[PDB]
Amino acid sequence: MIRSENITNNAKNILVQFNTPVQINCTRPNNNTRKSIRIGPGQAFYAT
């Protein structure tokens, strides 16, 4: 089905949900390491 409030009016968005699930792949091939930097007493900041 299609979800809409007025259809004719384009100001409002159209919400549509489909039946079959389509999968998604999203990877981060870059290797990152965290560095602990002392900002103040008891305060820590993590940087790449």
Ligand X SMILES: *[C@@H]1O[C@H](CO)[C@@H](O[C@@H]2O[C@H](CO)[C@@H](O[C@@H]3O[C@H](CO)[C@@H](O)[C@H](O)[C@@H]3O)[C@H](O)[C@H]2NC(C)=O)[C@H](O)[C@H]1NC(C)=O
Ligand Y SMILES: *[C@@H]1O[C@H](CO)[C@@H](O)[C@H](O)[C@H]1NC(C)=O
Ligand Z SMILES: *[C@@H]1O[C@H](CO)[C@@H](O[C@@H]2O[C@H](CO)[C@@H](O)[C@H](O)[C@H]2NC(C)=O)[C@H](O)[C@H]1NC(C)=O
Interaction site with ligand X (CB under 6 A): 4, 6, 8-9, 23-25
Specify the residue, 6 or 31, whose C-beta has the smaller distance to ligand Z.
Answer: 31
- Alpha carbon distance 39, 12 (integer Å): 47
Using CB under 8 A as the binding criterion, the count of chain residues that bind a copy of itself stands at 9
Specify the residue, 4 or 37, whose C-beta has the smaller distance to ligand X.
Answer: 4
Task: Tell me which residues touch a copy of itself (CB under 8 A).
Answer: 35, 37-42, 47-48
